[PDB]
C-alpha cells in the first residue's frame, strides 16, 4: 500500500462516506473534503480521515481548498472527485444553480487536477477518478442543468487521461445516483458497489480514459 | 414567417449560415459581440442585429430582454456563439467560466426563456452547434472541450423537455478545420446540416458529426 | 450521372427512396428478391431492375456479376436490403445466418467487389441502412439486432478503407422491422443529405422521432 | 461449486483466466479446438477439457450437448473463443462466415441453450470477450471487427432478456509490426499481460449491480 494519501471530495455524502471508510479499513491514509460539519464528518475523523473544509461553489472556495490541501501533503496516491450538488431548477434561480453545479462538478475537478498533478506524480501509482451520474447517457427532461454539468465532468475524464498519461490514470464511475423497478436487476444496491468500482480502477495498471457504468442495467430495461 | 435567431453570427460559420438563410428567404436575427464589417454585411443583407454578450449571466439576460422586444415568435434558435480561449496560467478559472457561460449557460437560459416564442411557431427548432473535439476529448483544450460536451447534453435534455412542439438537435463540426477526406471544408457543409435539421419533421435529440472522417483516420 | 444502386427495393422504404431518386433525375438500379407489382412500378419509373438473392455467398456473387454487366460505374450504393425473421425454436441458427447474409455478408462483398465502380465516379457514396434498435439492443430480436450492429461496424471500417474517394455513412431508422409515409420520407431526406454532403464520412444518422430521449 | 465455462481456453488470455480461476478455487470447464500443451496444462491444473468446434451450427450444438452431459449448473460462461482470419482473396466470404460462427453464432446458441444451467446457480454471469477495435473500426480487419461488434450487441440484448437472474457484460481488450504501432498509440505505453483481463473478469463476476456493460481494457488507446 502507498503511504501517500487518497483525497475523496464531498465525503459526507452517502457514497463518499462509505468509500472513505472502506479505504481507511483497506489501510490507505485518506483526506476528505467537507462543506458542512455533520455527524458523518465526525465519523470520518474518528475513523482516521483528515477533514479539510472545501466549498466548491465558487473559484475562490476551490482555490482556498487547494491551498489547504497543499499544506497538508506533498504527495497523493489518488483524487476521487465525489463532491456533488443536485439543485432544483427553481424559477428565478436557474442561472445561479447551474453556475453552482458547474463549479462543483466541473470547475473544481479541473482546478484540483491541474494544481494537484505534481502531488500525484510524486506517487509511483497515481489515479484520478471522477464520480459522475448515469443520467448523462439519456439526458434529463427534469434535471437539465445538473445533467449537463455531469456530462462536462465525463469530458474531463477523456481530456485529463490524455494530458496526464502515462504517469496518472484517469477514469470515471457513473452511478445511477437516484438509487428500483426501472433497473434490470431490480435490487437495491449498497454504496459497496461503488467502492468495488473504485478498487478495480485504483488497482488496475492498464485502464485509463474509461467510465464504469453502475446502474443495474437501467439502460437495457 | 417567424425569424430564425443565429447567435454569434460574426464568426465565420455563423456569418455563412445567416447569409444563406437570408438567401433562402428566411427572416433572420443575429447576435454579435463586436461591431465589424461582417455585422454590416448581415444588416445590409437583411438581418436584424442585436448585441449579445454571453460571457456572463447579466449579458445573457440583457440579450433575452432585447430579443423579446424584437419579436414575439421564433422559427428557430441556432446556438452558434463560441469562444475558444487558451488555458493561460493564472486565468484558467476565468476562461473556463467564460466558456461555460457562452456554450452552456447561454443556450440553457435562452432556450428556457424563449420556449414560448418558439411554440408560437407551427414548426420550431433549436440547433446547438458544438465541436467534434468532444468525441475524443482534448489534452490541450480541456476546459473548452468540457463546455462543448455540456452543450451536447443540453441537446438530449431539451429534446426531451420540449417534445413534441420543438425539435432540438446538434451539429458537431471539426471547428479546428474551419481528416480522412483530405479536403478543406467550406462553412456550407454546416449550412447543409442546418437545413436538414430545420426541414425534418421527425428528428429530435440527434447530433450530426461534420468532421471529414477524423474519427476513422 | 453514374447510377445509384439501391438494394432490396421492393421493401416500402427502398421503393420510396428509389422513386424519389428517379424523380430527382438520377439513374437508378434496384435489386429485388421476388417479382412484385412495385417492381413493375419501378421499371415504369425508369429503374434498371435486377434480381438479387442475398441469402448466401452464391446469390450475392451472382448479383454482383449481374450488376457488373450493367454498369462500369456507380454514383452510390445504398444497402437497404433488410430481412427480419423470428427466433423460431429449432430454426434460430438458420435465421441468424440468413440475417447475417443479408445485413453483413452482402454489404461486405458488394462494397469490396464494387469499389472500382464507385471510384470511377467523381463523387461516390456507400450508405448502410441499419436500424435504431442497435442503440439499446433488443430482448426479443437479439439476432436481428446483432446483425444490424455488425452492419454499423462496416460503416466505420469501410469509411476508413475507402477514404478519400468514397464516403461511407449509415442511416439507422426506428421500427424498420415493424414497417408494413413520414418515415420513408425522412429516410429519403437523410439519404439526400449524405449524398450531397462533401465532408461527412464514417457517420450514422439516427432517424427515430426522439425515441431515445422519451 | 457450480463450474465456470471459458471457451477457447488454449488462447493466451483464456488460458491465463482459466488457470487463475482454478487457483482462486473455482471449478472450471474449458473448450478447446485442438490438443495442445496448453490443454494438458489446463487438465493438470484441474480444468474439465471439452472439445468444441464453433465453426458451424452442428459443432456448436454438439458442444452444448456435450456440456449438458458434464454439468447441471454453471456459475458463468465466459465467451473467449476467438478466430482472427486474414481477408484472403477468394476466401473473404468463407472467413467472414467462420468468424460470424465463432464470435456471434456460438455465444448466441450457447447463451440461449445454457440459460437453464446458469439459473441453477444463485449468482450467474455471462461475459463476452470482444476486442477494443470495435470502437474505431478497422480498415484492415473489416470482417473480424464487424463480428466483434455483433458480439458486443449480444451483451445488450441478452442483458435485457436474462435479467434479473443472469448478469451479462463484456470485456473489450486491445487484443509484431501491429504491436509496435498499437503500443505507441496507447496512452499508458505499457504492454499488457492477460492478468489485466482476469482482473476485469473478477470485477464483473463479483459485482452485484452491473449488467449490460462493457469494460474497455486498452491502455487509453482511445485518448492518445
Instruction: Quote the CA–CA distance of A141 and B154 in Å, as a whole number.
Output: 9
In a 10 Å sphere around its CB, with 0-12 CB exposed, 13-18 middle and 19+ buried, how is residue D181 labelled?
Answer: exposed
The cell numbers describing C27, all together, are: 439513374
Q: Return the sign of the alpha-carbon dihedral for residues C204, C210, C211, C212.
A: positive
Task: Residue window 174-193, chain D: list those with CB within 8 Å of chain A.
Answer: 187-190, 192
Residues in chain C: 214
Query: Chain B closest CA to A89's CA: distance in Å?
Result: 11
Preferred mutation among C101, C107, C156 to probe D, highest tally of D CBs within 10 A: C156
- The chain A residue lying nearest D200, using CA atoms, is A200
Instruction: Quote the CA–CA distance of B171 and B130 in Å, as a whole number.
Output: 6
Give the pairing of strands A78-81 and D214-217: unpaired
Under an 8 A CB cutoff, do C146 and D104 touch? yes
Could you count the other beta carbons within 10 Å of the beta carbon of residue C32? Answer: 23
DSSP D8-34: TTTSHHHHHHHHHHHHTT--EEEEESS
Q: Which residues pair with B51 in a beta bridge?
A: B32
Q: Which residues pair with B172 in a beta bridge?
A: B209
C176 Cβ neighbours under 8 A, 6+ residues apart: C13, C82, C129, C131, C132, C133
Task: Residue window 120-159, chain B: list those with CB within 8 Å of chain D.
Answer: 136-137, 139
Q: What are the extents of the domains in chain B?
A: 1-217
Under an 8 A CB cutoff, do A217 and D163 touch? yes
Instruction: Quote the CA–CA distance of D38 and C189 in Å, as a whole number.
Output: 56
Could you count the other beta carbons within 10 Å of the beta carbon of residue A203? Answer: 12
End-to-end Cα, chain C, rounded Å: 42
Residue among A104, A50, A101 at smallest CA distance from A81:
A104
A54 Cβ neighbours under 8 A, 6+ residues apart: A9, A10, A33, A34, A35, A61, A62, A65, A68, A83
Compute CA distances B102 → A107, B8, B59, B176, C166, whole Å.
15, 10, 10, 18, 37
Compute CA distances B1 → B69, B111, B118, B124, whole Å.
17, 20, 12, 11
C199 is annotated as an active-site residue = no
Under an 8 A CB cutoff, do D142 and C154 touch? yes
Chain C residues touching residue D161 (CB < 8 angstroms): 139-140, 142
Cα angle value A33/A36/A37 (rounded, 5°): 95
Residue among A162, A155, A171 at smallest CA distance from A212:
A171
Query: Chain B closest CA to D106's CA: distance in Å?
Result: 29
Query: Chain B closest CA to C33's CA: distance in Å?
Result: 30
Cα angle value A155/A157/A159 (rounded, 5°): 75
Compute CA distances B5 → B16, B79, B99, B110, D114, whole Å.
14, 8, 20, 11, 58
Method of determination is: X-ray
Determine phi and psi for D153, rounding to 5 degrees.
-65, -40
Compute CA distances B67 → A54, B47, B113, D145, D165, whole Å.
40, 13, 10, 51, 56
Q: Tell me the H-state helices in B27-138.
A: 37-45, 57-70, 92-100, 106-118
Q: Are A155 and B149 in contact (CB under 8 A)?
A: yes
Q: What is the dihedral of CA A28, A29, A35, A40, to 10 degrees?
A: 60
Domain C1-214 has CATH 3.40.1000.10: no
Cα A80 to the center of its chain, rounded Å = 4
- The chain A residue lying nearest D224, using CA atoms, is A162
Preferred mutation among A155, A163, A168, A219 to probe B, highest tally of B CBs within 10 A: A155
Cα D26 to the center of its chain, rounded Å = 18
Rg of the Cα trace of chain C?
Answer: 16
Q: Which residues pair with C207 in a beta bridge?
A: C173
Resolution (angstroms) equals 1.8
Class of domain B1-217: alpha beta
Instruction: Quote the CA–CA distance of C135 and C141 in Å, as a whole number.
Output: 13
A65 Cβ neighbours under 8 A, 6+ residues apart: A33, A52, A53, A54, A55, A56, A108, A112
Cα A154 to the center of its chain, rounded Å = 11
**Could you tell me the maximum CA-CA distance found in chain C, to the nearest angstrom?**
49
End-to-end Cα, chain A, rounded Å: 40
Could you count the other beta carbons within 10 Å of the beta carbon of residue A42? Answer: 12
Query: Chain D closest CA to A218's CA: distance in Å?
Result: 9
Residue with cell 454498369: C71
C77 Cβ neighbours under 8 A, 6+ residues apart: C4, C5, C6, C7, C110, C111, C114, C118, C125, C126, C127
Under an 8 A CB cutoff, do A206 and D219 touch? yes
- The chain D residue lying nearest C153, using CA atoms, is D146
Residue with cell 465525463: A154
Helix C12-24 and helix C182-196: axis angle, to 10°? Answer: 50
Residue with cell 445509384: C4
- Identify the CATH number of the domain defined by range A1-221: 3.40.50.720
Under an 8 A CB cutoff, do B142 and A149 touch? no
Q: Tell me the H-state helices in chain B.
A: 12-23, 37-45, 57-70, 92-100, 106-118, 142-162, 188-199
Could you count the other beta carbons within 10 Å of the beta carbon of residue C139? Answer: 18
Instruction: Quote the CA–CA distance of C84 and C95 in Å, as a whole number.
Output: 9
The cell numbers describing B132, all together, are: 467534434
* From A146, A195, A200, A206, active-site residue: A146
Compute CA distances D22 → A137, D44, D125, D149, whole Å.
37, 11, 17, 30
Residue with cell 462543506: A35
Q: Which residues pair with B170 in a beta bridge?
A: B128, B207
Compute CA distances A209 → A104, A163, B136, C139, D11, whole Å.
21, 11, 10, 30, 27
Nearest to C202 among B156, B196, B215 (CB): B215
Q: Say if A221 is an interface residue toward chain C (CB within 8 Å).
A: no
**Could you tell me the maximum CA-CA distance found in chain D, to the nearest angstrom?**
49
Q: Are D170 and D158 in contact (CB under 8 A)?
A: no
- The chain A residue lying nearest C211, using CA atoms, is A138
Residue with cell 505499457: D190
Preferred mutation among D157, D161, D170, D172 to probe C, highest tally of C CBs within 10 A: D157
Instruction: Quote the CA–CA distance of B203 and B167 in Å, as a whole number.
Output: 7
Instruction: Quote the CA–CA distance of C46 and C26 in Å, as a whole number.
Output: 10
Q: Are B137 and C191 in contact (CB under 8 A)?
A: no
A37 Cβ neighbours under 8 A, 6+ residues apart: none
Give the pairing of strands C204-207 and C125-129: unpaired
Could you count the other beta carbons within 10 Å of the beta carbon of residue C37? Answer: 8
**For B108, what's the count of Cα atoms within 13 Å in the CB-facing half-sphere?**
34
Could you count the other beta carbons within 10 Å of the beta carbon of residue C192? Answer: 16
- Identify the CATH number of the domain defined by range D1-224: 3.40.50.720
Q: Are A51 and A6 in contact (CB under 8 A)?
A: no
Under an 8 A CB cutoff, do C157 and D138 touch? yes
Instruction: Quote the CA–CA distance of D175 and B131 in Å, as a whole number.
Output: 31
3-state secondary structure of B200: coil
The cell numbers describing D168, all together, are: 451479462
Amino acid at each position: 500500500l502507498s503511504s501517500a494519501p487518497i483525497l475523496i471530495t464531498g465525503a459526507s455524502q452517502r457514497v463518499g462516506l462509505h468509500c472513505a471508510l472502506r479505504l481507511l479499513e483497506h489501510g490507505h491514509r485518506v483526506i476528505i473534503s467537507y462543506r458542512t460539519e455533520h455527524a458523518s464528518v465526525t465519523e470520518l475523523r474518528q475513523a482516521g480521515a483528515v477533514a479539510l473544509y472545501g466549498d466548491f461553489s465558487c473559484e475562490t472556495g476551490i482555490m482556498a481548498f487547494i491551498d489547504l490541501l497543499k499544506t497538508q501533503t506533498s504527495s497523493l496516491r489518488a483524487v476521487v472527485h465525489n463532491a456533488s450538488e443536485w439543485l432544483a431548477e427553481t424559477p428565478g434561480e436557474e442561472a445561479d444553480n447551474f453556475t453552482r453545479m458547474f463549479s462543483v462538478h466541473m470547475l473544481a475537478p479541473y482546478l484540483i487536477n491541474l494544481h494537484c498533478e505534481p502531488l500525484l506524480t510524486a506517487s509511483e501509482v497515481a489515479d484520478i477518478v471522477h464520480i459522475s451520474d448515469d443520467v448523462t447517457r439519456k439526458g434529463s427532461s427534469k434535471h437539465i442543468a445538473y445533467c449537463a454539468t455531469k456530462a462536462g465532468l465525463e469530458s474531463l475524464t477523456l481530456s485529463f487521461a490524455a494530458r496526464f498519461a502515462p504517469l496518472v490514470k484517469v477514469n470515471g464511475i457513473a452511478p445511477a445516483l437516484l438509487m428500483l423497478a426501472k433497473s434490470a436487476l431490480g435490487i437495491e444496491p449498497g454504496a459497496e458497489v461503488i467502492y468495488q468500482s473504485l478498487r478495480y480502477l485504483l488497482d488496475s495498471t492498464y485502464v485509463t480514459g474509461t467510465t464504469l457504468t453502475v446502474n443495474g442495467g437501467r439502460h437495457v430495461k
